[model samples]
Target: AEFKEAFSLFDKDGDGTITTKELGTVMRSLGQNPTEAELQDMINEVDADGNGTIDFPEFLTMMARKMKDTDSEEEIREAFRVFDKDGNGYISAAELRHVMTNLGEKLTDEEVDEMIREADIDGDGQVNYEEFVQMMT
Candidate 1:
C-alpha cells in the first residue's frame, strides 16, 4: 500500500508513467537533487520491458525490495546484538562458542573455531560489525 500510494503521489503530470524528474524534484532526496540521472539508473533497474519509462509495477517491485532489504538488515543487526548479548563490544571466540552452545549442544568446538576464524577477517580473534554481517550473508 505504501508503494502503491507513493507511486501515485510522485507520478506527477499524470501521464500514466514516471520520470526521474518527478521523483527527484518531489523528494530531491539524494542530498542535492543530483539524482535526476541518478534516478534514471534506478528507473531502468525495474523497467523490465525496456519501455524506457517507469510504470506502477516497476515502482512496486522497487519499493518491495527496498523494504525487504531494510527488514533483513535490521533483523541481522538485532541478531548481532544478541550474539554478544553481554555487550563485550565484539564477538570473542568464547563468546560465539557460548552463543551456539546455548542454542544447542550439537556444535563441536572445532566447528565453532572454524566458523569464528572465517569471520574474524584479520585473525584479531573477534568478529566485529562488518565481519559479522559478512557471515550473515
Candidate 2:
C-alpha cells in the first residue's frame, strides 16, 4: 500500500516512531491546523504501542484500515448523519449550509449550489448516502 514510504516521510527522526510533533507537522503541511489537543487525540488513536508515538506497523495498520471500503462507507455514513440533521436519510442543501457555517466555513449560496451540483449525481437536489459516498470516495 506504499504505507511504508509514507510513514517514513513522517518519521523524520528515523527512530521507528512518529511523535505528536511529527504528525502535527504533516497535518499542517496538508493545510490542516490541528490544535495541540487534537494532535494528542490523534496520537492516542494511532499509538498502539502505548509509548506516545506511532510506530511503523501501527501507522501501516491504521492506514490500511482507513483505505478499506467498508470502513470508509461507515465513516461516510457517520459524517452524512451529521449533516442530515432531520434524520431524513438525505442531506438537504439547507443542512449543508448550516453545517458548513457551523464548521467555520463561510460559503456563498452559489458555492453551495455548486457543491450540491458536484455531489448530487441524480439531480435530486439532496445528497443521499450513495451519492455522498461516491463524492467522498
Candidate 3:
C-alpha cells in the first residue's frame, strides 16, 4: 500500500503516471535529458534494490527518509498535502501521474495502466483517497 504513496508522488500532475510529455517536462525542469546517463544514475539510486525501476515502498522510504534532517509531523503533513491535492483524504490518478513524472521517472503507458489497475479501488476507473492511502500504508 505504501507503494501507492510512492505512485502518487511520481504522478506529479495526478494524471496517473509518467506520460511522454510529462517525462520530458520533468527532465526539462531539471535542465537535463530524460535519456541522459546521469539521469539514469539517479534513477538507479532511487530504485534502491536495483530492480531497474522504483517501486512504491522503495520510493516512499526514500522520500520519507530524505527529509529526516527536518523531521516533523508538519513535514510529513506537508509531504502528504503535496500528494493529496484534492483534500478528499486520498490521491487520484491525475495527481499520482503528475508527481511521478516530475519527481520519480517517466513510465510507459502500459506501466501506468498496470499500476492504476493495481491501485484503483472500487473499480472507479481511477484511484480514490481510500485506495491511495491504503496503498501507501
Candidate 1 per-residue C-alpha lDDT over 60-113 given as tens digits, one digit per residue, 9 for 90 to 100: 778889899999999988988888867866887677888888887557778877
Query: Which pairs, if any, clash in model 1?
Result: none
**What TM-scores do the predictions have?**
0.77, 0.53, 0.36
lDDT string, candidate 3, 18-130, tens digits: 33444445667778666656556656776767755555566677667765745654565666668667776555567667767887768766666677789876886566555
Q: Is candidate 1 or candidate 3 better by TM-score?
A: 1
lDDT agreement of model 3 with the native: 0.63
Assess candidate 2 and give its TM-score to the true structure: 0.53
lDDT of 1 at 67: 91
TM-score of 3: 0.36
Candidate 1 yields a Cα-based lDDT of 0.80
Q: Model 2 residue 33 lDDT?
A: 89
Q: Model 1 off-target regions past 4 Å?
A: 29-32, 87-89, 106-112
Whole-model Cα lDDT of every candidate shown, in order: 0.80, 0.89, 0.63
